[PDB]
Design a protein around this motif. Sequence first.
Motif, PDB file in Angstrom:
ATOM      1  N   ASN A 252      -4.886   5.926  -6.691  1.00 13.28           N
ATOM      2  CA  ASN A 252      -5.358   4.512  -5.791  1.00 13.28           C
ATOM      3  C   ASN A 252      -4.504   4.566  -4.917  1.00 13.28           C
ATOM      4  N   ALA A 253      -2.520   4.752  -5.017  1.00 13.07           N
ATOM      5  CA  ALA A 253      -2.099   3.832  -5.020  1.00 13.07           C
ATOM      6  C   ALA A 253      -1.270   5.015  -3.666  1.00 13.07           C
ATOM      7  N   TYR A 254      -1.274   6.649  -4.004  1.00 13.24           N
ATOM      8  CA  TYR A 254      -2.567   7.436  -2.417  1.00 13.24           C
ATOM      9  C   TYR A 254      -2.750   7.241  -1.708  1.00 13.24           C
ATOM     10  N   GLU A 255      -4.050   6.771  -2.127  1.00 12.16           N
ATOM     11  CA  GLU A 255      -5.392   6.953  -1.274  1.00 12.16           C
ATOM     12  C   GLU A 255      -5.184   5.020   0.113  1.00 12.16           C
ATOM     13  N   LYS A 256      -4.417   4.316  -0.755  1.00 12.86           N
ATOM     14  CA  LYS A 256      -3.743   3.092  -0.121  1.00 12.86           C
ATOM     15  C   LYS A 256      -2.779   3.236   0.735  1.00 12.86           C
ATOM     16  N   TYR A 257      -1.657   3.681   0.195  1.00 17.61           N
ATOM     17  CA  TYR A 257      -0.443   3.611   0.711  1.00 17.61           C
ATOM     18  C   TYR A 257      -0.004   4.673   1.698  1.00 17.61           C
ATOM     19  N   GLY A 258      -0.473   6.056   1.104  1.00 15.93           N
ATOM     20  CA  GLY A 258       0.086   7.347   1.736  1.00 15.93           C
ATOM     21  C   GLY A 258       1.240   8.061   0.419  1.00 15.93           C
ATOM     22  N   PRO A 259       1.755   9.263   0.877  1.00 13.34           N
ATOM     23  CA  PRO A 259       3.149  10.202   0.302  1.00 13.34           C
ATOM     24  C   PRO A 259       4.404   8.738  -1.155  1.00 13.34           C
ATOM     25  N   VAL A 260       4.517   7.874   0.137  1.00  8.30           N
ATOM     26  CA  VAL A 260       6.101   7.402   0.404  1.00  8.30           C
ATOM     27  C   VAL A 260       5.193   5.846  -0.520  1.00  8.30           C
ATOM     28  N   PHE A 261       6.006   4.893  -0.519  1.00  5.53           N
ATOM     29  CA  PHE A 261       5.616   3.923  -1.480  1.00  5.53           C
ATOM     30  C   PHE A 261       6.226   2.784  -2.842  1.00  5.53           C
ATOM     31  N   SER A 262       7.209   1.952  -2.680  1.00  5.11           N
ATOM     32  CA  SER A 262       7.212   1.137  -3.862  1.00  5.11           C
ATOM     33  C   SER A 262       7.271   0.380  -4.221  1.00  5.11           C
ATOM     34  N   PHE A 263       7.370   0.091  -5.337  1.00  7.97           N
ATOM     35  CA  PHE A 263       6.444  -1.199  -6.607  1.00  7.97           C
ATOM     36  C   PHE A 263       7.365  -1.492  -7.793  1.00  7.97           C
ATOM     37  N   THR A 264       7.454  -2.112  -8.325  1.00 13.38           N
ATOM     38  CA  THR A 264       8.404  -2.815  -9.277  1.00 13.38           C
ATOM     39  C   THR A 264       7.872  -3.503 -10.413  1.00 13.38           C
ATOM     40  N   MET A 265       8.352  -3.185 -11.770  1.00 14.97           N
ATOM     41  CA  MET A 265       8.085  -3.013 -13.206  1.00 14.97           C
ATOM     42  C   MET A 265       8.842  -3.657 -13.519  1.00 14.97           C
ATOM     43  N   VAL A 266       8.758  -4.773 -14.227  1.00 14.68           N
ATOM     44  CA  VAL A 266       9.897  -5.630 -15.421  1.00 14.68           C
ATOM     45  C   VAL A 266      11.240  -5.418 -14.439  1.00 14.68           C
ATOM     46  N   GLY A 267      11.244  -6.337 -12.673  1.00 19.10           N
ATOM     47  CA  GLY A 267      12.468  -6.317 -12.093  1.00 19.10           C
ATOM     48  C   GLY A 267      13.190  -5.205 -11.403  1.00 19.10           C
ATOM     49  N   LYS A 268      12.510  -4.089 -11.994  1.00 17.04           N
ATOM     50  CA  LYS A 268      13.301  -2.588 -11.104  1.00 17.04           C
ATOM     51  C   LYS A 268      12.244  -1.899 -10.144  1.00 17.04           C
ATOM     52  N   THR A 269      12.961  -1.644  -8.196  1.00 20.14           N
ATOM     53  CA  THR A 269      12.413  -1.507  -7.966  1.00 20.14           C
ATOM     54  C   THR A 269      12.134   0.213  -7.906  1.00 20.14           C
ATOM     55  N   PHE A 270      10.728   0.769  -8.167  1.00 20.86           N
ATOM     56  CA  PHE A 270      10.230   2.477  -7.595  1.00 20.86           C
ATOM     57  C   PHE A 270       9.930   2.750  -6.283  1.00 20.86           C
ATOM     58  N   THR A 271      10.340   3.479  -5.808  1.00 20.17           N
ATOM     59  CA  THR A 271       9.706   5.046  -4.566  1.00 20.17           C
ATOM     60  C   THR A 271       9.490   6.087  -5.580  1.00 20.17           C
ATOM     61  N   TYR A 272       7.852   6.521  -5.456  1.00 20.19           N
ATOM     62  CA  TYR A 272       7.027   7.675  -5.285  1.00 20.19           C
ATOM     63  C   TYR A 272       7.057   8.133  -4.231  1.00 20.19           C
ATOM     64  N   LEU A 273       7.290   9.879  -4.638  1.00 22.76           N
ATOM     65  CA  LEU A 273       6.909  10.932  -3.787  1.00 22.76           C
ATOM     66  C   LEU A 273       5.621  12.572  -4.179  1.00 22.76           C
ATOM     67  N   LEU A 274       5.115  11.458  -3.978  1.00 22.66           N
ATOM     68  CA  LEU A 274       3.715  12.318  -3.641  1.00 22.66           C
ATOM     69  C   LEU A 274       3.524  13.251  -3.337  1.00 22.66           C
ATOM     70  N   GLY A 275       2.535  14.283  -3.204  1.00 23.58           N
ATOM     71  CA  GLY A 275       2.830  15.304  -2.220  1.00 23.58           C
ATOM     72  C   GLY A 275       3.312  16.419  -2.107  1.00 23.58           C
TER      73      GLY A 275
END
Length: 445
Positions: A30-53
Amino acid sequence: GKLPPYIFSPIPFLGHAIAFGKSPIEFLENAYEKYGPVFSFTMVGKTFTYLLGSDAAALLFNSKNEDLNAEDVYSRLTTPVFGKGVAYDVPNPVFLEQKKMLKSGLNIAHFKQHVSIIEKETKEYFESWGESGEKNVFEALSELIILTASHCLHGKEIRSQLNEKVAQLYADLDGGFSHAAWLLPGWLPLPSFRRRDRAHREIKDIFYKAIQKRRQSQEKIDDILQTLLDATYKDGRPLTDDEVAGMLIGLLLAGQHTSSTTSAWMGFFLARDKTLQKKCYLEQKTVCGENLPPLTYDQLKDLNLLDRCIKETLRLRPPIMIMMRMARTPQTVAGYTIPPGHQVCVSPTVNQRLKDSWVERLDFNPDRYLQDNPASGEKFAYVPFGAGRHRCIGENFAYVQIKTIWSTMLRLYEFDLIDGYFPTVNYTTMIHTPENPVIRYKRRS
Ligand SMILES: O=C(N[C@@H](Cn1ccnc1)c1ccc(-c2ccc(F)cc2)cc1Cl)c1ccc(-c2nnc(-c3cc(F)cc(-c4ncncc4F)c3)o2)cc1
Ligand SMILES: O=C(N[C@@H](Cn1ccnc1)c1ccc(-c2ccc(F)cc2)cc1Cl)c1ccc(-c2nnc(-c3cc(F)cc(-c4ncncc4F)c3)o2)cc1
Ligand code: HEM
Ligand SMILES: C[C@H](CCC(=O)O)[C@H]1CC[C@H]2[C@@H]3CC[C@@H]4C[C@H](O)CC[C@]4(C)[C@@H]3C[C@H](O)[C@]12C
Ligand SMILES: C[C@H](CCC(=O)O)[C@H]1CC[C@H]2[C@@H]3CC[C@@H]4C[C@H](O)CC[C@]4(C)[C@@H]3C[C@H](O)[C@]12C
Ligand SMILES: C[C@H](CCC(=O)O)[C@H]1CC[C@H]2[C@@H]3CC[C@@H]4C[C@H](O)CC[C@]4(C)[C@@H]3C[C@H](O)[C@]12C
Ligand SMILES: C[C@H](CCC(=O)O)[C@H]1CC[C@H]2[C@@H]3CC[C@@H]4C[C@H](O)CC[C@]4(C)[C@@H]3C[C@H](O)[C@]12C
Ligand SMILES: C[C@H](CCC(=O)O)[C@H]1CC[C@H]2[C@@H]3CC[C@@H]4C[C@H](O)CC[C@]4(C)[C@@H]3C[C@H](O)[C@]12C
Ligand SMILES: C[C@H](CCC(=O)O)[C@H]1CC[C@H]2[C@@H]3CC[C@@H]4C[C@H](O)CC[C@]4(C)[C@@H]3C[C@H](O)[C@]12C
């Protein structure tokens, strides 16, 4: 120098931790469809950036450990299990040396010795299964994989000491790989923690004995254990007793769960597509002979359909779903600047079923690799063994092991679903396990 898009936390501290934990794949899709291949979100106060494709993922795989660090994230969980002086407890350069030492051991000379050892272990274990019935393949494969890997990677001596006690010590080390382990402080006197730390010292002590024994011994043996004992650094120093023990642990843990789950998943893909399973059995005759003789290493290479069935399994059920690094310095990709502190992540699972790059992306059709496909077409569309300085050194041993076992298994039995049930993914374990992985079997022809 713009940052990547940030998926605003619905919940203040927890962010998207709840949503992610249920279906992390679905989430990232869903994140890919709506935000593209590069995006950041938070879990338990930690920021993750994901590299899809491939294009994006490239950044992670291409990068130096100076810039996108693996220890920064992995050290705290591994050091307590693998032990000191090994893996992420040392600078990356020292690890890359230790990786060569391990790699050398994994050659054609030893792969030959292994096939027969693995075939024998496979036949002897599946004595207990009788002529037919319904039993958990995963439980069975995990038990088999540890014996094979220990025999192969450790040697007959250490394999001969493998009682159900030592099996439970290896599980107690694996309990060190838990969400609790990286969520909670290490100074909590947790059972799982204490059983890990106990199982560590006791296994080190077992290896200390077996190592001393081999060094003293006039006995010359050409196995992986000796490869390490004889090996040296660039400086010229040889490994310590402890450094060796550390690597023997890493070896077994690496070998077992990655292969066992992968093997278990194929067994259900093959159980569903009976047409494909039949061809996989008739291949064995066609390649080895109508008489089905003892497997040899050189026969493996000619097992194209089995090889492609594995490849197609790791595509859909890669055991290591996510590889992540700590950003030490800025890193640009697709016009975005990932700042230091972000935990940069890649997903083999997502990368290996992206609609845009995968025709019939959910389907198990192993013949998809006999035409132009993202595995040979794209740099990082297919990465179940990863890439760059952290890529897998166990890709070949893995295939050897998975081939031999399943080669022997197909010969021994015909496999089938129970009431046409196909295991769903249990995301609650560290390595995703198949929900209710019991299979129907019966003697082959
Ligand atoms: O959860 C904590 N820290 C991290 C989470 N973490 C740490 C290790 N692994 C995970 C953390 C803390 C806050 C945040 C955060 C992020 C965004 C926000 F909008 C809010 C918080 C994010 C994180 Cl990750 C945490 C942070 C801080 C405390 C803590 N530290 N000191 C205090 C504290 C409490 C007090 F009652 C008094 C004081 C205090 N300190 C100095 N002088 C006088 C004082 F009274 C400090 O609380 C306890 C726990
Ligand atoms: O399985 C791991 N290492 C294996 C990988 N492997 C297996 C086969 N090939 C690679 C491993 C890696 C190296 C070795 C090894 C063996 C022998 C050697 F000589 C050298 C290395 C052995 C093993 Cl078992 C592993 C290592 C570290 C972690 C880890 N550490 N921290 C986390 C972690 C931290 C977080 F803050 C969050 C999360 C996290 N996890 C899932 N979902 C969301 C999350 F946020 C995970 O994961 C998780 C798994
Ligand atoms: C299906 C079987 C296996 C799979 C899918 C697999 C997958 C991977 C992946 C994806 C990585 C990259 C980790 C990262 O980028 O953070 C990796 C690294 C590694 N694997 Fe494996 N692996 C397998 C079997 C093995 C075996 C059998 C061994 C040893 C006998 C092994 C040893 C390693 C080592 C030493 C690393 C290096 C980790 C690093 O450099 O940080 N693996 N593996
Ligand atoms: C998000 C990871 C799972 C990562 C993965 O799936 O690999 C999981 C592992 C531990 C999970 C935490 C367990 C403690 C909490 C359990 C509660 O019932 C609601 C979720 C909480 C607040 C956390 C949310 C989230 O579900 C976490 C952090
Ligand atoms: C505050 C309670 C203690 C209350 C009690 O035991 O009754 C403690 C006990 C367990 C603690 C939880 C540990 C899981 C989580 C650790 C994360 O770093 C974020 C804080 C979380 C979501 C919780 C932090 C909080 O500090 C808790 C809930
Ligand atoms: C300290 C972290 C908070 C998470 C974090 O800030 O990293 C949490 C995780 C588990 C929490 C413990 C819960 C059980 C412990 C007894 C009480 O029932 C609550 C206080 C104690 C002594 C601890 C309180 C403290 O809040 C801890 C240790
Ligand atoms: C939250 C950590 C421990 C959990 C963790 O390591 O994440 C706990 C453990 C030690 C705790 C410290 C104890 C010394 C101090 C106690 C004071 O009365 C005010 C907070 C201080 C400055 C700290 C409070 C904070 O709650 C800490 C740092
Ligand atoms: C648990 C924390 C730190 C986290 C850890 O490393 O375990 C430890 C580290 C130092 C400890 C503090 C030192 C002063 C206090 C008296 C003792 O001289 C030590 C325990 C006390 C009561 C404090 C509370 C707690 O026991 C602390 C803060
Ligand atoms: C870990 C901290 C302090 C760090 C240390 O132990 O040095 C210790 C201090 C007090 C510890 C708790 C006391 C009561 C709990 C039962 C025992 O009657 C004592 C250990 C237990 C299980 C708890 C473990 C927990 O971890 C705490 C809060």
